Amino acid sequence: ADKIVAGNAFLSQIGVNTIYDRAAALSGNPEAQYKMKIDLVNGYIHIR
Amino acid sequence: ADKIVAGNAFLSQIGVNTIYDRAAALSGNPEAQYKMKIDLVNGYIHIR
């Protein structure tokens, strides 16, 4: 599916470019509203 | 279901008032037989 909307998701090994919090992800601009960021592609963690 | 009996349960985001150990939960009186307690409603952890 294009988008998976569920409060209960399960992925032991998740292939995701970058992990954002739910509020930032649903806001439409995660890059400017994230409290934490786990960018797996670049390999760095940024915490505001 | 009223009760879920399984040795393998999966809840990434679990909405539960208080978490008890299996032995205390199945004993019928978790409040007097728990070794650890995670009360999410009140926000405190008690370890015996």
Side-chain angles (χ1 to χ4, degrees), chain B residues 5-19:
Chain B
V5 178
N8 202 28
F10 302 97
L11 282 83
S12 308
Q13 170 192 302
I14 174 166
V16 56
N17 289 336
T18 303
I19 304 176

Side-chain angles (χ1 to χ4, degrees), chain B residues 24-36:
Chain B
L26 289 166
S27 72
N29 198 0
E31 282 292 329
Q33 299 260 312
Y34 71 94
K35 290 192 182 181
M36 51 66 78

